[PDB]
């Protein structure tokens, strides 16, 4: 679509290894994000310092938006490369000149940000009303649905740590490695330390 | 005055809603916008069995059911209730789209509440996540005496709030709740008397 592409041609590209981090929590927010290639991991930190990851963002996702809306904001949280990253930057400054020019562009990001609402509050909901074992379910049936996912002759494997698993269900690697072990005694996934296949 | 505002509510209806009355049922299909004219609301979602999480209040000034608007046919993500007496200017979303498309502005107003909503149900997922029902009572008692109107006293900090209220906060039953504001108190964490607690 030309909507996309004219919002590209104002962007300048940066490319980020796996594991650096685009965005630290606290900086102030001047920029618009929008990726073009790889995966991010959204993190935020309990008051006790444990780090939890609110979501993964993929190609086609907006990120930044949070500080365009209103003056002095500052960045809500931190962003890091899951994979190796190409994203595309713009200054808030030039995207409000873009969004005054076609509306349609900020309808895509604004889509992105009622969805994330959307599913941000079913997570905390989720966090009161599941046990882990639900949650870790869930979780590991929306991993297999990720770009990184790989087609198995019996599903779909996906490649993650027990760390990784509990920093988005909020529960310890231990308690993970517990519950990956009755899933698969309830033949709905088959574990091999960090790869496991999902059935479906 | 908002100009912007003015000629978008000039294309809306208005309705009353008593106080206690439901607005928007989680569940239904979502075709219309709101803008609360006067009073408030709480937005809350809800287990199976209908235990009930608060996520936001909202007041004059907020648009509420605005989730389902960049893609028709999705449902209310969350009940929407009257805390007060409510007025609420309504559109469809057809409408809205169409606004939007003369003076995106309107998308900015909407937007901004929509980021301010997402940082702020980040922020409970990071609250709420590695803790049990019990840790989440513990903390969110330990917030409230950090809140503008906690007044000061000998043994601590002394706090206004009810079973039902703390009940929504952290989405378990005020039988729960009341369960464990007695140990708490046992524990020499705090000292609860009815309505009233003194956090140490
Ligand atoms: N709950 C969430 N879901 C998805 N993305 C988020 C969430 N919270 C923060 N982000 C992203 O993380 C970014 C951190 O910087 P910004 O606040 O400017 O913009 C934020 C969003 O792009
Ligand atoms: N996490 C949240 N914070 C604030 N408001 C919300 C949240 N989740 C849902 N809502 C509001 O509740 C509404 C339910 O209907 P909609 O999904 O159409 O629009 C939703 C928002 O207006
Ligand atoms: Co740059
Ligand atoms: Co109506």
């Known amino acids: 679509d030309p909507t996309l592409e ?5 962007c300048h590209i940066h490319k980020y290894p ?7 929590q606290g900086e102030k927010a001047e920029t618009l994000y929008y990726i073009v290639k790889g995966s991010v991991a959204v993190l935020i930190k309990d008051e ?5 990851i609110l ?3 993929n190609q086609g996702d907006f990120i930044g938006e ?3 809306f209103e003056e002095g904001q500052e960045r809500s949280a931190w ?3 899951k994979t190796a990253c190409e994203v595309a930057e713009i200054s808030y400054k030039k995207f409000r000149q873009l969004i005054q020019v076609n509306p349609d562009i900020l309808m895509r990001l604004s889509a992105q940000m009622a969805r994330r609402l959307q599913v941000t509050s079913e997570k ?9 074992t639900g949650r870790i379910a869930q979780t ?3 991993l297999a649905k990720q770009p990184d996912a790989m087609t198995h002759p019996d599903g779909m494997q996906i490649k993650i740590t027990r760390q990784e698993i509990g920093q988005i269900v909020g529960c310890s690697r231990e308690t993970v490695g517990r519950i990956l072990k009755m899933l698969e005694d309830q033949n709905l996934i088959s574990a091999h330390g960090k790869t496991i296949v999902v059935y479906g």
């Open 6 to 10: 004219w919002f590209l041609s104002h």
């Open 18 to 24: 796996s594991k650096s981090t685009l965005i630290h």
């Open 48 to 52: 006790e310092g444990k780090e939890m």
């Open 55 to 57: 979501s993964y963002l």
């Open 66 to 68: 949070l500080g365009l």
């Open 79 to 81: 962003v890091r490369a």
């Open 124 to 132: 905390v909901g989720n966090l009161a009303f599941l046990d882990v």
């Open 140 to 142: 590991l049936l929306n």
